């Protein structure tokens, strides 16, 4: 079995990685079609909410 | 080309933060009041 | 311990709110964005402090 | 100078944006260690 403290550390590390990836996508994609960009960002924000 | 990139990225960022504010209000109503102030802090 | 739990929850909510405000700063006036960045990190750093007593 | 002034201002905005992007990348690279 996996201790829930290790799971908590894994979850926070995954959350930090997800924020880094989301902001990297924002930085390297701002300017891609607006609709696809908006859909991908909505997916990323749903991921943020679920991770929270 | 640089100016068009600037305008497109400004529009993209505007829609980003509009959608993020809307959803933060939706799932977190208790934080709704600061978020609008955040807009007032940004806009 | 309930006080620490509620402090952590309010700190997480404030961290999300400050992340939203910082990305808005990047959106409109990114030139001073760092002025908030380290601030957010402090809260994150405080989170680490909040782990230290829980150890 | 009119075209020159507009030209220089737009150039300044362009590499200011580029420098902001590079600073963001450097900040993430530095802060990944603290993750």
From Swiss-Prot, chain A:
It is found in: Nucleus. Component of the Mediator complex, which is composed of at least 21 subunits that form three structurally distinct submodules. The Mediator head module contains MED6, MED8, MED11, SRB4/MED17, SRB5/MED18, ROX3/MED19, SRB2/MED20 and SRB6/MED22, the middle module contains MED1, MED4, NUT1/MED5, MED7, CSE2/MED9, NUT2/MED10, SRB7/MED21 and SOH1/MED31, and the tail module contains MED2, PGD1/MED3, RGR1/MED14, GAL11/MED15 and SIN4/MED16. The head and the middle modules interact directly with RNA polymerase II, whereas the elongated tail module interacts with gene-specific regulatory proteins. Present with 1391 molecules/cell in log phase SD medium. Belongs to the Mediator complex subunit 21 family. This is Mediator of RNA polymerase II transcription subunit 21. It comes from Saccharomyces cerevisiae (strain ATCC 204508 / S288c). The lineage of its organism: Eukaryota, Fungi, Dikarya, Ascomycota, Saccharomycotina. The chain holds residues 1 to 70 of 140 of the full protein.
From Swiss-Prot, chain B:
Transmembrane segments: none annotated. It is found in: Nucleus. It comes from the Eukaryota. Component of the Mediator complex, a coactivator involved in the regulated transcription of nearly all RNA polymerase II-dependent genes. Mediator functions as a bridge to convey information from gene-specific regulatory proteins to the basal RNA polymerase II transcription machinery. The Mediator complex, having a compact conformation in its free form, is recruited to promoters by direct interactions with regulatory proteins and serves for the assembly of a functional preinitiation complex with RNA polymerase II and the general transcription factors. Belongs to the Mediator complex subunit 10 family. Present with 1472 molecules/cell in log phase SD medium. This is Mediator of RNA polymerase II transcription subunit 10. It comes from Saccharomyces cerevisiae (strain ATCC 204508 / S288c) (Baker's yeast). The chain holds residues 106 to 148 of 157 of the full protein.
From Swiss-Prot, chain C:
Keywords: Activator, Nucleus, Transcription, Transcription regulation. It is found in: Nucleus. It comes from the Eukaryota. GO terms for biological process: negative regulation of transcription by RNA polymerase II; positive regulation of transcription by RNA polymerase II; positive regulation of transcription elongation by RNA polymerase II; positive regulation of transcription initiation by RNA polymerase II; regulation of transcription by RNA polymerase II; RNA polymerase II preinitiation complex assembly. Signal peptide: none annotated. GO terms for cellular component: core mediator complex; mediator complex; nucleus. Present with 7598 molecules/cell in log phase SD medium. Component of the Mediator complex, a coactivator involved in the regulated transcription of nearly all RNA polymerase II-dependent genes. Mediator functions as a bridge to convey information from gene-specific regulatory proteins to the basal RNA polymerase II transcription machinery. The Mediator complex, having a compact conformation in its free form, is recruited to promoters by direct interactions with regulatory proteins and serves for the assembly of a functional preinitiation complex with RNA polymerase II and the general transcription factors. Belongs to the Mediator complex subunit 7 family. This is Mediator of RNA polymerase II transcription subunit 7. The gene is MED7.
From Swiss-Prot, chain D:
Component of the Mediator complex, which is composed of at least 21 subunits that form three structurally distinct submodules. The Mediator head module contains MED6, MED8, MED11, SRB4/MED17, SRB5/MED18, ROX3/MED19, SRB2/MED20 and SRB6/MED22, the middle module contains MED1, MED4, NUT1/MED5, MED7, CSE2/MED9, NUT2/MED10, SRB7/MED21 and SOH1/MED31, and the tail module contains MED2, PGD1/MED3, RGR1/MED14, GAL11/MED15 and SIN4/MED16. The head and the middle modules interact directly with RNA polymerase II, whereas the elongated tail module interacts with gene-specific regulatory proteins. It is found in: Nucleus. Coiled coil: none annotated. Component of the Mediator complex, a coactivator involved in the regulated transcription of nearly all RNA polymerase II-dependent genes. Mediator functions as a bridge to convey information from gene-specific regulatory proteins to the basal RNA polymerase II transcription machinery. The Mediator complex, having a compact conformation in its free form, is recruited to promoters by direct interactions with regulatory proteins and serves for the assembly of a functional preinitiation complex with RNA polymerase II and the general transcription factors. Belongs to the Mediator complex subunit 14 family. Signal peptide: none annotated. It comes from the Eukaryota. Transmembrane segments: none annotated.
């Amino acid at each position: 079995m996996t201790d829930r403290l290790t799971q908590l550390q894994i979850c926070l590390d995954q959350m930090t990685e997800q924020f880094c990836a989301t902001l990297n996508y924002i930085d390297k994609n701002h300017g891609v079609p607006p609709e696809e960009f908006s859909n991908t960002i909505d997916e990323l924000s749903t991921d943020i909410i679920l991770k929270t | 080309r640089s100016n068009q990139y600037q305008r497109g990225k400004m529009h993209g960022l505007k829609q980003l933060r509009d959608s993020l504010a809307d959803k933060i209000v939706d799932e977190f109503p208790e934080l709704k009041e600061p978020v609008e102030d955040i807009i007032k802090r940004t806009s | 311990y309930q006080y620490k739990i509620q402090e952590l929850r309010k700190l997480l909510k404030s961290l999300l709110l400050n992340y939203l405000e910082l990305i808005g700063v990047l959106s409109i006036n990114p030139d001073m964005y760092e002025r908030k960045v380290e601030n957010i990190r402090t809260i994150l750093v405080n989170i680490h402090h909040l782990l230290n007593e829980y150890r | 100078h009119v075209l020159i002034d507009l030209l220089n201002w737009f150039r300044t905005t362009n590499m200011n944006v580029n420098n902001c992007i590079w600073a963001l990348k450097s900040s993430l690279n530095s802060m990944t260690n603290a993750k």
